[PDB]
Amino acid sequence: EDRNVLRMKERERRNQEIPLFAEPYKVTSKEDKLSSRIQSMLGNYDEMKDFIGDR
Amino acid sequence: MEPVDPRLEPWKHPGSQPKTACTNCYCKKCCFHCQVCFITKALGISYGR
Amino acid sequence: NNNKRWYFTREQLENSPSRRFGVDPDKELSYRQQAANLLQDMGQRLNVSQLTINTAIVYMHRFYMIQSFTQFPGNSVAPAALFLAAKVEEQPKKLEHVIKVAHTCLHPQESLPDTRSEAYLQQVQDLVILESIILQTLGFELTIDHPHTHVVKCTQLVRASKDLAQTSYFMATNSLHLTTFSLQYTPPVVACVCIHLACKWSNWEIPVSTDGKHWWEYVDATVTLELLDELTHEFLQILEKTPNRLKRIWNWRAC
Amino acid sequence: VECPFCDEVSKYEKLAKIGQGTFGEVFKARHRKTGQKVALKKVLMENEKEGFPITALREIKILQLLKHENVVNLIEICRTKGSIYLVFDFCEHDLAGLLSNVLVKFTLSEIKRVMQMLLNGLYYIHRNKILHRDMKAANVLITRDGVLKLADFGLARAFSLAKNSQPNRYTNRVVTLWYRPPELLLGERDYGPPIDLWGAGCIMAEMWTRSPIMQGNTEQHQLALISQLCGSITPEVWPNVDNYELYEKLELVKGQKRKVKDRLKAYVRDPYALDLIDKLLVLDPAQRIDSDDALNHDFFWSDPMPSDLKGMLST
Numbered sequence: 134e135d136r137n138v139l140r141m142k143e144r145e146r147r148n149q150e151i152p153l154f155a156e157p158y159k160v161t162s163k164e165d166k167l168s169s170r171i172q173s174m175l176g177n178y179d180e181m182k183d184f185i186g187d188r
Numbered sequence: 189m190e191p192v193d194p195r196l197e198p199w200k201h202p203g204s205q206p207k208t209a210c211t212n213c214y215c216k217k218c219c220f221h222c223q224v225c226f227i228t229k230a231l232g233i234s235y236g237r
Numbered sequence: 238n239n240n241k242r243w244y245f246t247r248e249q250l251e252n253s254p255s256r257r258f259g260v261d262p263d264k265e266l267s268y269r270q271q272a273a274n275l276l277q278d279m280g281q282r283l284n285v286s287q288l289t290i291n292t293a294i295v296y297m298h299r300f301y302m303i304q305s306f307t308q309f310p311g312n313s314v315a316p317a318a319l320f321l322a323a324k325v326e327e328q329p330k331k332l333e334h335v336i337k338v339a340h341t342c343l344h345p346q347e348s349l350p351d352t353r354s355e356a357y358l359q360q361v362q363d364l365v366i367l368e369s370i371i372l373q374t375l376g377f378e379l380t381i382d383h384p385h386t387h388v389v390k391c392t393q394l395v396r397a398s399k400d401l402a403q404t405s406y407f408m409a410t411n412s413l414h415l416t417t418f419s420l421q422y423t424p425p426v427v428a429c430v431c432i433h434l435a436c437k438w439s440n441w442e443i444p445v446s447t448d449g450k451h452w453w454e455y456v457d458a459t460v461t462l463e464l465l466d467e468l469t470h471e472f473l474q475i476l477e478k479t480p481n482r483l484k485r486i487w488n489w490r491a492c
Numbered sequence: 493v494e495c496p497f498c499d500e501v502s503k504y505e506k507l508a509k510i511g512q513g514t515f516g517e518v519f520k521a522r523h524r525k526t527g528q529k530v531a532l533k534k535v536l537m538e539n540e541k542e543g544f545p546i547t548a549l550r551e552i553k554i555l556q557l558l559k560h561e562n563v564v565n566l567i568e569i570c571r572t573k574g575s576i577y578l579v580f581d582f583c584e585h586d587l588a589g590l591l592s593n594v595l596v597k598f599t600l601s602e603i604k605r606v607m608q609m610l611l612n613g614l615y616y617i618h619r620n621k622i623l624h625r626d627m628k629a630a631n632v633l634i635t636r637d638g639v640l641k642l643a644d645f646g647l648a649r650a651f652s653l654a655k656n657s658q659p660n661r662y663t664n665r666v667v668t669l670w671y672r673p674p675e676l677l678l679g680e681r682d683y684g685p686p687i688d689l690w691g692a693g694c695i696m697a698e699m700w701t702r703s704p705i706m707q708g709n710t711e712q713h714q715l716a717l718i719s720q721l722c723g724s725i726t727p728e729v730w731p732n733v734d735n736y737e738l739y740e741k742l743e744l745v746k747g748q749k750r751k752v753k754d755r756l757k758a759y760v761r762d763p764y765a766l767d768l769i770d771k772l773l774v775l776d777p778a779q780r781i782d783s784d785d786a787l788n789h790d791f792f793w794s795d796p797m798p799s800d801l802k803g804m805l806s807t
């Protein structure tokens with residue numbers, strides 16, 4: 134009933150309208166069919182990695 | 189080719205034009221010169237005849 | 238169900254407006270890729286953001302789920318889409334400039350038409366018209382979300398190396414150029430596929446989080462390893478069907 | 493030429509012209525079958541020099557995002573069998589019109605409510621990273637039920653809190669000259685929400701003067717009027733204003749003292765009202781009051797409390 138309260142209640146109504154992972158590592162084996170495929174088609178990643186992007 | 193921080197505002201994003209002009213060389217470096225070169229040279233896709 | 242408007246089933250993609258006019262699936266997909274390539278080229282000459290190009294590409298993909306390549310050539314639609322995207326993504330280019338760049342790309346032989354010539358003002362009229370047609374075709378839904386946003390955000394979270402960050406982002410661009418994933422799966426899903434593909438290629442492995450959840454769970458709650466493998470599969474399938482069918486055509490020589 | 497996601501404007505019947513927008517003509521119309529009233533804002537593609545206006549594109553983008561009780565509502569976008577029409581929910585009145593209407597009389601209570609709704613709207617769009625950039629009485633609509641609506645976002649845009657680093661270079665010559673703040677006239681391009689609140693001050697003064705308080709004809713004239721009313725623009729009252737390239741290139745009167753309350757005293761009378769206007773028309777935007785502080789100002793929580801407009805509007 135008081136202004137201070139009625140004021141604050143309105144301030145809030147206003148307002149209410151608005152390391153997880155370890156560092157990734159290389160994996161030599163085991164190999165899965167998906168990876169094996171990809172590498173056979175795109176080739177060797179490390180041979181390409183310095184051409185994709187900036188140095 | 190090169191990542192861009194999405195948190196940048198649209199008018200802040202860098203231009204896509206590569207620093208060097210596209211060539212007609214088909215060496216490894218030139219086939220991965222830029223997105224256009226990769227799509228056209230390495231993957232053989234063209235809009236022109 | 239306003240989301241599923243610009244997202245389609247394979248039955249819908251198979252029954253494209255272009256299929257309706259007798260255009261082979263592989264040939265339509267080709268027309269899309271060429272338009273994407275053209276958008277990318279022009280965009281790079283105009284020196285707009287990749288965001289602009291990406292938005293222009295999604296417009297194109299969506300445009301041709303309503304209109305047919307029979308009726309609207311990619312080489313006429315593309316400059317209009319890029320011109321529009323340039324404004325939407327707050328890096329607008331003068332109409333004169335776009336027609337210039339478009340001419341360079343599609344007619345390297347011809348001379349750049351005079352700005353006073355009747356033929357030049359005709360080029361202007363066509364572009365401005367197409368822009369109006371693109372706008373109406375899309376229902377003025379011009380706000381596009383891209384995989385690149387989620388890809389970059391995710392690589393930061395998982396502490397990827399520059400090469401892995403670069404490659405994931407690179408595959409995101411390739412997804413727009415070479416596939417119709419933008420019409421099938423939401424940007425977060427596509428972002429995972431790209432990261433997943435970059436990892437399988439590079440042999441980088443992203444472990445499980447400190448709270449026991451896979452990395453894609455922090456990108457989209459609907460994604461599962463079954464889906465990722467299956468879509469990476471489809472992505473590779475599209476890559477093979479490209480001309481030069483992936484064969485390494487470079488020369489191991491100087492310049 | 494298929495077009496499933498863009499209905500023909502034929503579904504509406506134009507009733508009358510109702511002013512000129514940022515980029516078009518505006519018409520009142522009613523839906524032919526249901527009688528629902530709307531405002532059709534016609535995109536005037538006379539300017540085929542740059543195709544569809546980026547100005548209109550921003551409005552469409554922004555209003556698809558913004559949804560608030562004190563922001564005007566975009567319904568759809570329609571075509572002609574062509575020209576494009578933006579379709580808004582119709583509002584019976586606009587604040588400029590009401591203030592010009594001699595038969596319309598505001599109680600203090602009703603003025604408080606108008607300013608409350610206005611600043612509530614500004615508070616919302618600002619927290620959603622949107623600048624209106626055209627605050628003026630004519631762009632403030634009020635419905636039959638006395639609900640204020642910010643309108644005409646043709647001049648609006650998104651802005652950044654970027655980034656403790658490279659600053660933004662927004663468009664400088666924006667906001668109608670009369671309601672344009674000092675920093676814009678001095679060529680600021682890295683501005684923010686304060687420019688809208690300068691306008692709010694200008695509008696709040698109009699609630700009592702019934703006439704725009706600074707009607708300049710040029711940017712220099714406007715600056716002169718501001719100096720006369722708000723005091724001379726000096727580093728003492730506005731730190732680092734020196735740094736504006738045009739601060740000395742324009743030659744600004746140095747003697748003027750601040751006369752905001754002095755000149756508005758006779759018209760406004762209410763003490764709190766005068767104070768709030770005084771805080772809104774601060775020269776230095778860094779020191780100018782913001783939406784949140786303004787909305788907590790005693791003006792809005794002292795007697796007489798704000799009341800609904802519905803009463804006054806039926807006359």
Ligand SMILES: Nc1ncnc2c1ncn2[C@@H]1O[C@H](CO)[C@@H](O)[C@H]1O
Nearest residue numbers: 511512513518531582583586630644
């Ligand atoms: N829904 C509306 N009702 C009344 N006037 C409007 C409406 N929309 C725009 N206007 C008028 O259009 C002009 C600005 O676009 C102003 O004169 C404003 O009053």
Ligand SMILES: [Zn+2]
Nearest residue numbers: 210221222225
């Ligand atoms: Zn290149």
Ligand SMILES: [Zn+2]
Nearest residue numbers: 213215218492
């Ligand atoms: Zn070379």
